[PDB]
Design a binder for this molecule. Structure first.
Ligand SMILES: NC(=O)c1ccc[n+]([C@@H]2O[C@H](COP(=O)([O-])OP(=O)(O)OC[C@H]3O[C@@H](n4cnc5c(N)ncnc54)[C@H](OP(=O)(O)O)[C@@H]3O)[C@@H](O)[C@H]2O)c1
Ligand SMILES: Nc1nc(=O)c2nc(CNc3ccc(C(=O)N[C@@H](CCC(=O)O)C(=O)O)cc3)cnc2[nH]1
Ligand SMILES: [Mn+2]
Ligand SMILES: [Mn+2]
Ligand SMILES: [Mn+2]
Length: 159
C-alpha cells in the first residue's frame, strides 16, 4: 500500500524556494509518528531541503543522476523506488510536488495537514479529485503558544 503525507497551506501551497517557511511543531510530531519504522520516498529537491537522513526510516531518494551519499538509497524511477521498499505494509511518499504528482494515482491513503496560513509558494500539492476519496479521520486544533496557526489533520482513503 502506498500513502502520501503532506502539509498544505492555503491554495495547496507546500513550499517556497525549496523550503517550508512556517513552523508547526505539532505537525512535525504527526509526521514522525506516521512515518517512523516505514520506508519514505522523496525527490531529490526534498532531500536537499531536509538536509539529513530521517532516523528510524529507510530513506529512498529519486534522482535521474547517481547518488552522492550512501546513508540513503538512490533510485532512478518510480518502479525502482517501490521495489527498493520490499514487502512492507505501507510505503510513505513524502514529496515534493513532482513526486506527489507521480505517486497520487498509485496511492490508497492520504495523510494531509491543512494549515490556516496564507503562503506565497512556488510548489503545490496535486489537484486531486475529491469524489475519489473518503475522509476517515479529522482532528482540528486551534493555534497555541507553540503552533502559530490553526491546523486540521485529515486521513483520506481511496473509495
Ligand atoms: N509541505 C510539505 O508537505 C512538503 C513535503 C515535501 C516537500 N515540500 C517542499 O516541496 C518542494 C520540493 O518539491 P519539488 O517538486 O521542487 O521537488 P521534488 O519532487 O522533491 O524533487 C524533484 C526531483 O526528484 C527527482 N525525480 C522525481 N521524479 C523522478 C523520477 N520518476 N525518476 C527520477 N528522478 C525523479 C528529480 O531529481 P533530479 O533533478 O536529480 O533527476 C527531480 O528534479 C520544496 O519547497 C519542499 O520544501 C513540502
Ligand atoms: N504533515 C507534514 N508535515 C511536514 O512538515 C512534512 N514535511 C515533509 C518534508 N520535509 C520534512 C522536513 C523536516 C522533517 C523533520 O525534521 N522531521 C523530524 C521531526 C520530529 C519531530 O519534530 O517530532 C522527524 O524525525 O520526522 C521531516 C520532513 C513531508 N511531509 C510532511 N507532512
Ligand atoms: Mn522502468
Ligand atoms: Mn514483493
Ligand atoms: Mn494563520
Amino acid at each position: 500500500m502506498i500513502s502520501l503525507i503532506a502539509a498544505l497551506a492555503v491554495d495547496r501551497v507546500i513550499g517556497m524556494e525549496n523550503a517550508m517557511p512556517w513552523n508547526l511543531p505539532a505537525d512535525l510530531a504527526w509526521f514522525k509518528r506516521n512515518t517512523l519504522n516505514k520506508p519514505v520516498i522523496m525527490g531529490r529537491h526534498t532531500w536537499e531541503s531536509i538536509g539529513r537522513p530521517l532516523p528510524g526510516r529507510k530513506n529512498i531518494i529519486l534522482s535521474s543522476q547517481p547518488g552522492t551519499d550512501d546513508r540513503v538509497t538512490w533510485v532512478k524511477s518510480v518502479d525502482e523506488a517501490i521495489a527498493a521498499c520490499g514487502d512492507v505494509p505501507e510505503i510513505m511518499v513524502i514529496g515534493g510536488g513532482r513526486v506527489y504528482e507521480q505517486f497520487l494515482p498509485k496511492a490508497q491513503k492520504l495523510y494531509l495537514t491543512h494549515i490556516d496560513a496564507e503562503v506565497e509558494g512556488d510548489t503545490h500539492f496535486p489537484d486531486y479529485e475529491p469524489d475519489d476519496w473518503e475522509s476517515v479521520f479529522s482532528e482540528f486544533h486551534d493555534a497555541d503558544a507553540q503552533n502559530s496557526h490553526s491546523y486540521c489533520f485529515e486521513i483520506l482513503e481511496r473509495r
